[PDB]
Each structure stands twice: as C-alpha cells, then as structure tokens.
Design a protein around this motif. Structure first.
Motif, PDB file in Angstrom:
ATOM      1  N   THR A   1      24.106  12.731 -34.128  1.00 56.77           N
ATOM      2  CA  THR A   1      24.264  13.270 -32.709  1.00 56.77           C
ATOM      3  C   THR A   1      25.797  12.772 -32.275  1.00 56.77           C
ATOM      4  O   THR A   1      26.386  11.965 -32.705  1.00 56.77           O
ATOM      5  N   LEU A   2      26.330  13.642 -31.400  1.00 55.62           N
ATOM      6  CA  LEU A   2      27.602  13.777 -31.059  1.00 55.62           C
ATOM      7  C   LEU A   2      27.679  12.905 -29.834  1.00 55.62           C
ATOM      8  O   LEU A   2      27.438  13.012 -28.779  1.00 55.62           O
ATOM      9  N   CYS A   3      27.933  11.797 -30.045  1.00 53.40           N
ATOM     10  CA  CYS A   3      28.061  10.687 -29.044  1.00 53.40           C
ATOM     11  C   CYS A   3      28.932   9.482 -29.378  1.00 53.40           C
ATOM     12  O   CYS A   3      29.327   9.262 -30.363  1.00 53.40           O
ATOM     13  N   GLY A   4      29.592   8.937 -28.102  1.00 52.62           N
ATOM     14  CA  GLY A   4      30.433   7.824 -28.161  1.00 52.62           C
ATOM     15  C   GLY A   4      31.417   8.111 -26.719  1.00 52.62           C
ATOM     16  O   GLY A   4      31.032   8.893 -26.143  1.00 52.62           O
TER      17      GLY A   4
END
Ligand SMILES: Nc1ncnc2c1ncn2[C@@H]1O[C@H](COP(=O)(O)OP(=O)(O)OP(=O)(O)O)[C@@H](O)[C@H]1O
Ligand SMILES: [Ca+2]
Ligand SMILES: [Ca+2]
Lengths: 20, 337
Positions: free
Chosen positions: B184-187
């Motif tokens: 997941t592309l997250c942050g």
C-alpha cells in the motif's frame, strides 16, 4: 540557511498523510 | 530477557487479536467537551465519562468518509490492533463502539500535546532530549515488529507526550499485521522510505527508515528531505543524499547514515542483528534501555498541566456538532468493529 528555507516553506504545519 | 518477554507479549496479543473486544461503551456515557485535533474522516475530542468522571480522548470516525477515502480495511486494522497491544509507550484504548453514523475509539487522554507542537515551538531538541524519545520509539518498534505488526505512520504529529514527559504513540490508521511484504502506498511524504515511493513492495524496515527521519527532524528542527510539493520530496528521498546540520555529533550522523540507508541490505534494524545494531550504536551508548522501558529515566521536558481536563498543550479547532443519523450507515462493512 536550511532552517530559513524550511520555515519559509509551505510544509511547516501539521502534515497530512497519503494513502489509497 | 527480551526473548521471554516478547514471547509472553505475543501470547497476550494473539488472544486479543483472535477474539477482539467490541461494543464496550456508548456515546451517551460521555460529555464531549473540546476538539483536541482533527483528522481525515473525523476528529478527536476531549470527553468526560459521566459515571467515572475520568477524561478521555474520543476519536470519532465518520463511516461514510472512511468509505469515501477507501479506508475500511485500514480502519478495521487500526481498531483490531490497538485493542490487542500493550506497551508502556503505546496509547491505551479504553473503549470502542459504533452507532448508525460513526465509529468511536475512546483512549486515555494524553494531556501533554503532540511532539509536533513542542518541536516547532522550541525549534529543535538537544541530542540527549531527542535520544530519550528515540529510545522509546526503538523499544516500541521492537515490540510491534515482534508481533508481525508494521506501523507505517511515524511522525511528530502522532507522538503524544504524557504527564511524565514520556511518549505515547497514537494513530494506528496504517498499522498492519503482515508476514513478509506489503504494497500500500501510504504514510506521510517526508517520512516515506524509498522502497515505498518506488512501488516495490516492502517490509517493516520502512519503520526503521522513518525512525531515521524522526531522529533527524527532532535533532535538526526540520526534516532531512523537504520541498513545497511531495514530488520534489520524493526525488530527494530517492536520491538518498542527506546533509546534516553543523551541530550534529559524529555519532548522530553515523546512526542516521545507517537508518536513512536506501539499501535494505544495509539499513540498520533490518540486518542480522536486527534491532541490536541500533540499541548498541554509539549514539545510544548512554541509553539505559531497561530504565527507559521501566520509565525510570527522568524526562528532559515535562509539559505544564493544570486540571485533568486542561487542553492548553493543544491547538484550538473549529467545533461542529456530532450528528448521528436515524439510518444505519455501512453496517455490514464495519460489522467486526
Ligand atoms: N489519546 C489522545 N489524547 C490526546 N490527544 C489525542 C489522542 N489521540 C489523538 N489525539 C489528538 O488528535 C489528533 C488526531 O488524532 P489521529 O492522529 O488519531 O487522527 P486521524 O483521525 O487518524 O487523522 P489523520 O490520520 O489525518 O491524522 C492527534 O494528533 C492529537 O492532536
Ligand atoms: Ca494522525
Ligand atoms: Ca490516521
């Protein structure tokens, strides 16, 4: 200075995440 | 011995992971006083619990907004994980419940405010000051990682300071129980590991990078990679070129070079010795790891507090009444909450 460049930037307040 | 400690900690966690807590309070058990912070799909409020008189922080999530930002699984993650963990520097979830409109997570109120505000206000932290905080994060990541949990949202805006000046990690919105890699592309852009940015698939070593960004930002007063728009942040991160303030110690610089290491085979926290390379680094030589876990170390800064419901360590926010529809929203989606 790096400090002054940071402080003049648009990203000195609370930062929002990113996600899907 | 960590090993024995960590093994019983996992046994505890799994029991709750497997049979999660549910529906342990209800909205009318509390008086809502003031918004402590806002978020993507809701807000966190200082609240007073009527029967006990205790103050808490109530995180209120609009189900509909959760769905619209495609954060269902992540939210279930958040709650399922927070009710099962237990560590001196993790915020305590006291209650959770839901109604027709919202999801509620009621936590201990950490009245010290965000690390974020004190950092920006003071400007930067001394290395002893930053080291005291960093040690708490190192132990917390050791704990979490040992449970197959990845945190993925380290940053000052999520680290709260308690009345003893110790840290309380909050917001498990991106935390996940995973063995092996995830995608997941997250942050937050300033804190993203290069392998997240390059869409490779990644593991818990992204948290060790984030620690590197954290320690830098704490000690420098600004993050190692910044720009006006994230794309430029991303190029800088991917470069891996890092410059340090003239006041950084040689020890600090060495540690940071090993945490902000674009090469996973080289990044501290991810090698054969795992976290011990970090605990044993020269920058941490004065750190008493046990005394920190046992919270026996005097903190370098102790927030001003007056009354259990004092919010002076927090920014003010615009208030909005908490609406609850007569129709159940997203009931099936959030069944397990
Ligand atoms: N236990 C708590 N005690 C005191 N304040 C809290 C607590 N939990 C959260 N807050 C305050 O509320 C803010 C927002 O909380 P949180 O980070 O969990 O929000 P969110 O809904 O996940 O939004 P986002 O992910 O966009 O930040 C925190 O940064 C902090 O200011
Ligand atoms: Ca947050
Ligand atoms: Ca969140």
């Amino acid at each position: 200075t790096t400090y002054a460049d940071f402080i003049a930037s648009g990203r000195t307040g609370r930062r929002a995440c990113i996600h899907d | 011995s960590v090993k024995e400690f960590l093994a019983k900690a996992k046994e505890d966690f799994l029991k709750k992971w497997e049979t999660p807590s549910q529906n342990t309070a209800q909205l009318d058990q509390f008086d809502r006083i003031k918004t402590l912070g806002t978020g993507s799909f809701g807000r966190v409020m200082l609240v007073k619990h009527k029967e006990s008189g205790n103050h808490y922080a109530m995180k209120i999530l609009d189900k509909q907004k959760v769905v619209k930002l495609k954060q269902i699984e992540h939210t279930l993650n958040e709650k399922r994980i927070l009710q099962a963990v237990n560590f001196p520097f993790l915020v305590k979830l006291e209650f959770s419940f839901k109604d027709n409109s919202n999801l509620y997570m009621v936590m201990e109120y950490v009245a010290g405010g965000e690390m974020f505000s004190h950092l920006r206000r003071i400007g930067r932290f001394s290395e002893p000051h930053a080291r005291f905080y960093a040690a708490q994060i190192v132990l917390t990541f050791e704990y979490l990682h040992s449970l197959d949990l990845i945190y993925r949202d380290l940053k000052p805006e999520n680290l709260l300071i308690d009345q003893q000046g110790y840290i309380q990690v909050t917001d498990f919105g991106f935390a996940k129980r995973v063995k092996g890699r995830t995608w997941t592309l997250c942050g937050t852009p300033e804190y993203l590991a290069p392998e997240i940015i390059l869409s490779k698939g990644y593991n818990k070593a992204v948290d060790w990078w984030a620690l590197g960004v954290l320690i830098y930002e704490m000690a420098a007063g600004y993050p190692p990679f910044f720009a006006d728009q994230p794309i430029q942040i991303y190029e800088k991160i991917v470069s891996g070129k890092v410059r340090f303030p003239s006041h950084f110690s040689s020890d600090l610089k060495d540690l940071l070079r090993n945490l902000l290491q674009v090469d996973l085979t080289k990044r501290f926290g991810n090698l054969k010795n795992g976290v011990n390379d970090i605990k044993n680094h020269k920058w941490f030589a004065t750190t008493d790891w046990i005394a920190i876990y046992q919270r026996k170390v005097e903190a370098p800064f102790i927030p001003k507090f007056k009354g259990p419901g004092d919010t002076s360590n927090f920014d003010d926010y615009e208030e909005e009444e908490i609406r609850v529809s007569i129709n159940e929203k997203c009931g099936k989606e959030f069944t397990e909450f």
